Design a protein around this ligand. Sequence first.
Ligand SMILES: CN(C)Cc1ccn2c1[nH]c(=O)c1c(Cl)cccc12
Length: 115
Amino acid sequence: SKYMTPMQQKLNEVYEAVKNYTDKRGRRLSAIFLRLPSRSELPDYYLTIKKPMDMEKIRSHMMANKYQDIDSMVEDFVMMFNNACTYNEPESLIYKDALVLHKVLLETRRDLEGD
Ligand SMILES: CN(C)Cc1ccn2c1[nH]c(=O)c1c(Cl)cccc12
């Protein structure tokens, strides 16, 4: 069916709020987070990040209908943001963008608390 259940609609709304967020200059902060590069590209990344995560992984899990609740999706986004803030320096743009998208995530979930 093309009709999503209420839980599926809520998962999709959360995912899309993070994906689609743009700053005041029109930059889509999710860009860098869509797909993690390889070991070759980020030498230290897979040696230092225990549980790699990107938005394509979350999206595919969502599309396979494998998230049972909203907390489960939020957990994977929070993992991704913690990973970004572990690998990257606090002065880096990626670290700053992770912090903004984390707020988008939490604000979106809270604004759907009644739904
Ligand atoms: C270019 N550079 C130093 C880092 C870089 C470039 C790509 N990505 C990162 N760092 C990340 O942690 C990261 C995460 Cl969570 C998810 C997806 C992509 C990421």
